[PDB]
Design a protein around this ligand. Structure first.
Ligand SMILES: [Zn+2]
Ligand SMILES: [Zn+2]
Lengths: 49, 243, 114, 269, 179, 194
């Protein structure tokens, strides 16, 4: 059980919910335009020591 | 000789023990006692590894012992015990004999048909899917741009939350219909005593969990706590800077 | 006792009586199709039954290895092989009558002699 | 310690019933020791696995469902009860996926392909032919134990388990080598995992010759499996009971309770 | 612009419906392929009931060439296949719900459902099975006199850029006349 | 093989044609065979619309007759992520497909199938015998609706409630004799007569 949870299901539990963005175009009209300020954060590969 | 899968916390050897439960996502039936208005029921547990614990209980209840032969069902988030012909029509099976073909399999037997005839007479009134879906089941949250209840809202319920197995995306209502028909079929077998009462105490219908699932559960929940704190301080950085 | 359906639209037919010609006319509540009834029988409650010990037979019951085997013969084909098993109905008063199914004559027969 | 690693524990509540699982059940065979129970207010709550007992760690089902599509099912979208009055429903972890016309070929094909090793052997399958149903289980949480396979047919005649003297000779040689393993016996299909759910499609043999040919003590013909040894239904302390048939069961219960409180040695370091 | 209705000439067309294994379907859904080239051969009987696919050697034998056709549904009713092109460019009636009816053409009736199954006797067959198992004060006062003439409730924040001056000087000047 | 058959190994679609093509599959849910080119009071329009009060919605013949007679944000939010193709599919099927004749005597309401829309491929014979391969995209299912003068949700709720221990068997026949909520064909005929 321990080896199975170390090898897999951890990369799965990361890639299930890793996405988080807050892209602020202008959040009101103008501001001309403003630009679609993609504040993007997400997690890729994981590591163990 | 110290072959042992334990853990070393604070200078103490430390082991975890298995936990058990009934297996989820599998049919059971019960025979509740006589004085209650319910006689024969069923249940489905659920979990899909394991976002927001995915509990999502289900039951289908039965009335009478007599002339109260009716089959209502409950779903989240519906507080009313909904009769089931409504559910068939709402999922999109209008013509009556086809609901019958979804339920039973041998057309030559009939006892199921007299069992269901009062239920069809219950469903004699509503003849359209969105009219059926118009039944309220409020239970929160507040209405959006609606009239009484959005049919979009009801279909969103039936897609996203109900029956967290076979699908939850958009388009497999016929799989749902067959699954519910099989459930009704086994409930009717338990009611008509051709097939017997199930057992809760049999072993294979239970499961044993271990460190894998346990660390999975705790790690998921604290990861969600983590993620909500990640969303915290992202709104707070109205001012500088990107630390 | 069966539930007929309207052949124009597969819907549950209901009984409704002629006002003057004194005949049961199964009129569709969906469409205007109507049909006279063969018998004055409409509804039937059947508070007592004793049925269900027999069926559930597949054509290859004997393909499963778990059923026991005997040497009584089928009284049509006389082959001595057989598969025997008890009632398929389970009430608290079902009998210890037995059901004997063969492969050669592929036939079901019992051991009662009253 | 080697007892205490393999423990299990359920929650119930305060008082509970008695036919409810406080007392043992026939389903428990080959999995949990019918003696090694603790005593006092929780007897029948904690229970202890078998020796060869092994747990299921799960395997993703989509290769299986694609395999099952490719070898032919009607997917449910065009099912009709009239034109398919008797075909078998197919389940995977309690999920409807198919109804299929010819069950026997499918069942033997899955069994053979499990034996050849192209499927993880943790997966289990039941043909409840009495109800024309078929089950597939691949989750994590099942319990299983080994068996000796049997082919019914035999050029030498009547019925036989497949394994022979040469294989066990090779095992003896590899052990005294100081290249077979248990897995290297598994891959070519001589033993087979069977879970806690399957057995009702299987006849069991107590001894390797109990009826296999066609005063001390006192002791059908369609077997498919025999146990490795009847002595291995026990548990950890249950092994230590000398001649455990030759007493009464509550004495075994106190013995399993007592053995945890024995001194001696525990490690060497 | 064009006609909003549907074409009807191509309605009268029998169509055969095929399912396919995943590896074969990936090759037969290649848009880099599919230009008119002929890639297989067929062989029916006079009475039917056994049709085989003679796949041409374009596959280079990573897959079989011997295949059989499994006509599951020999007779098919009410199954219609159509096409779509976007357009060239109590009694309340809504003629525009922003529905976008298209140049749509019903182009065929399905008559025969079938399937191509890899014939297991082929050596390239079941190899796929192991594969599937592996995978400035003054001026600004006139200027502000113009500003209230421009608009009555002029913004204090909008007053800043119209002055771009010392605001304490601006605050004193604002108090002398209005708000 | 001896050529007792129509051998034509496949030709294929023009790639330049294949852009802007969406070729779905249609089925009717009735045991009787239906051919719309024989049944429908053409012209037939295919539209993607909402279905709210579709019985109360006017027919195209009624529309033609009427035409002839007349002539501060809180600066913080979160889009929890979702698949763009799934969202596009959801917005596409936010309204379903409906085809019907000009009269409105027969109308058909469609729905969407996600079961097996990937694996299918088309063998449509051409006039010469050509077999063009059109890879299918989606399959849609159509049912008839309001062919039989459907009822109303409110009085339906009053029949559902325990006002009657058993509702009348011919209550729909009595309502039809009253003339409330008649058929779409009957409403179109009455509007054409008026
Ligand atoms: Zn009718
Ligand atoms: Zn016989």
């Amino acid at each position: 059980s321990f080896n199975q949870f170390v090898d897999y299901t951890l990369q799965d539990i990361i890639c299930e919910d890793s996405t988080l963005i807050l892209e602020q175009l202008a959040q009101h009209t103008t501001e001309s335009d403003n630009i679609s300020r993609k504040y993007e954060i997400s997690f890729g590969k994981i590591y163990v020591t | 000789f110290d072959m042992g899968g334990y853990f070393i916390i604070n200078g103490s050897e430390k082991v975890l023990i298995a936990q058990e439960r009934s297996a989820g996502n599998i049919v059971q039936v019960f025979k509740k006692a006589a004085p209650s208005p319910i006689s024969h029921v069923a249940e489905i547990r659920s979990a899909l590894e394991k976002g927001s614990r995915f509990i999502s209980t289900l039951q289908v209840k039965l009335y009478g012992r007599s002339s109260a032969r009716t089959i209502k069902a409950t779903l989240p988030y519906i507080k009313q015990d909904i009769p089931i012909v409504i559910i068939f029509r709402a999922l999109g099976i209008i013509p009556d004999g086809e609901i019958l073909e979804h339920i039973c399999y041998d057309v030559n037997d009939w006892q199921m048909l007299e069992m269901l005839k009062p239920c069809v007479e219950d469903g004699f009134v509503i003849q359209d899917r969105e009219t059926a879906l118009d039944f309220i089941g409020r239970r929160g949250t507040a209405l959006g741009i609606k009239k009484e209840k959005r049919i979009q809202y009801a279909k969103d319920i039936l897609q996203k939350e109900f029956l967290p197995h076979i699908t939850q995306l958009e388009g497999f209502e016929s799989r749902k219909a067959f699954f519910l028909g099989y459930m009704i079929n086994r409930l009717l077998l338990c009611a008509l005593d051709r097939k017997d009462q199930d057992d809760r105490d049999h072993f294979g219908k239970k499961r044993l969990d271990l460190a894998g699932p346990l660390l999975a559960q705790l790690f998921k929940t604290l990861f969600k706590k983590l993620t909500k704190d990640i969303f915290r301080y992202m709104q707070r950085t109205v001012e500088e800077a990107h630390d | 006792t069966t539930f007929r359906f309207c052949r124009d639209c597969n819907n549950m037919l209901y009984p409704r009586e002629d006002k003057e010609n004194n005949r049961l006319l199964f009129e569709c509540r969906t469409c205007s199709y109507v049909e006279e009834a063969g018998s004055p029988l409409v509804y039937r409650h059947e508070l007592i039954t004793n049925i269900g010990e027999t069926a559930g037979v597949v054509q290859d019951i004997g393909s499963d290895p778990t059923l026991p085997r005997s040497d009584r013969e089928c009284p049509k084909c006389h082959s001595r092989e057989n598969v025997f098993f008890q009632s398929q109905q389970r009430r608290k008063d079902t009998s210890m009558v037995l059901f004997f199914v063969c492969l050669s004559c592929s036939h079901i027969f019992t051991s009662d002699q009253k | 310690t080697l007892s205490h690693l393999r423990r299990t524990n359920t929650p119930i509540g305060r008082d509970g019933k008695l036919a409810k699982p406080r007392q043992l059940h026939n389903t428990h065979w080959g999995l949990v020791c019918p003696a090694e129970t603790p005593e006092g207010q929780a007897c029948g709550l904690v229970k202890n696995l078998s020796l060869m007992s092994c747990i299921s760690v799960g395997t993703d089902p989509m290769p299986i469902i694609t395999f099952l599509s490719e070898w032919g099912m009607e997917p449910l979208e065009d099912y009709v009860p009239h034109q398919s009055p008797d075909a078998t429903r197919v389940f995977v972890n309690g999920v409807w996926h198919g109804v299929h016309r010819n069950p026997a070929r499918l069942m033997e094909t899955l069994r053979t392909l499990r034996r050849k090793g192209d499927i993880n052997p943790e997966v289990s399958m039941i043909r409840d032919i009495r109800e024309k149903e078929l089950k597939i289980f691949t989750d994590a949480g099942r319990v299983y134990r080994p068996l000796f396979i049997v082919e019914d047919d035999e050029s030498l005649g009547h019925k036989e388990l497949k394994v022979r003297k040469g294989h066990i000779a090779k095992l003896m040689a590899t052990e005294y080598q100081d290249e077979y393993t248990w897995s290297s016996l598994l891959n070519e299909g001589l033993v087979e995992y069977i879970d806690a759910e399957e057995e009702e499609s299987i006849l069991i043999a107590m001894q390797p010759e109990d009826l296999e040919p066609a005063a001390k003590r006192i002791r059908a013909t369609t077997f498919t499996h025999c146990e490795i040894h009847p002595s291995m239904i026990l548990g950890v302390a249950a092994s230590i009971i000398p001649f455990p048939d030759h007493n009464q069961s509550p004495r075994n219960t106190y013995q399993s309770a007592m053995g945890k409180q024995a001194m001696g040695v525990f490690l060497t370091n | 612009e064009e006609s909003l209705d549907l074409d009807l000439e191509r309605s009268n067309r029998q169509v055969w419906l095929v399912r396919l294994p995943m590896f074969l379907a990936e090759k037969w859904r290649d848009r880099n392929n599919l230009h008119g080239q002929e890639l297989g051969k067929i062989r029916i009987n006079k009475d039917g009931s056994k049709i085989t696919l003679l796949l041409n050697e374009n596959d280079n034998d990573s897959i079989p060439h011997e295949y059989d056709l499994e006509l599951t549904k020999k007779v098919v009713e009410n199954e219609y296949v159509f096409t779509e092109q976007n357009l060239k460019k109590r009694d309340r009636y809504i003629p525009y719900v922003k529905t976008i009816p298209k140049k749509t053409a019903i182009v065929g009736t399905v008559c025969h459902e079938c399937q191509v199954m890899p014939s297991m006797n082929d050596p390239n067959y079941h190899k796929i099975v192991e594969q599937r198992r592996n995978i400035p004060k003054k001026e600004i006062l006139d200027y502000l006199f113009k500003l209230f003439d421009e608009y009555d409730y002029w913004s204090l924040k909008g007053l800043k850029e119209r002055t771009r001056q010392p605001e304490a000087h601006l605050k004193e000047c604002l108090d002398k006349v209005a708000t | 093989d001896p050529n007792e058959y129509n051998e034509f190994p496949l030709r294929a679609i023009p790639k330049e044609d294949l852009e802007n093509m969406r070729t779905h599959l249609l089925k009717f849910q009735s045991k009787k065979k239906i051919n719309p080119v024989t049944d429908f009071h053409l012209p037939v329009r295919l539209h993607r619309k909402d279905t709210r009060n579709l019985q109360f919605q006017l027919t195209r013949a009624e529309i033609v007759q009427r035409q002839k007679e007349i002539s501060l944000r809180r600066k913080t939010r979160q889009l929890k992520v979702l698949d763009e193709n799934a969202k596009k599919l959801r917005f596409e099927e936010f309204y379903p497909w409906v085809m019907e004749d000009f009269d409105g005597y027969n109308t058909w309401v469609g729905s969407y199938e996600a079961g097996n829309s990937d694996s299918y491929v088309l063998l449509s014979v051409e006039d010469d015998g050509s077999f063009t391969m059109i890879p299918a995209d989606k399959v849609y299912k159509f049912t008839a609706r309001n062919k039989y003068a459907t009822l109303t949700i409110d009085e339906a709720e009053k029949r559902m409630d325990k006002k009657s221990g058993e509702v009348p068997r011919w209550l729909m026949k009595h309502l039809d004799n009253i003339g409330t909520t008649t058929t779409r064909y009957d409403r179109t005929r009455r509007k054409l007569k008026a």
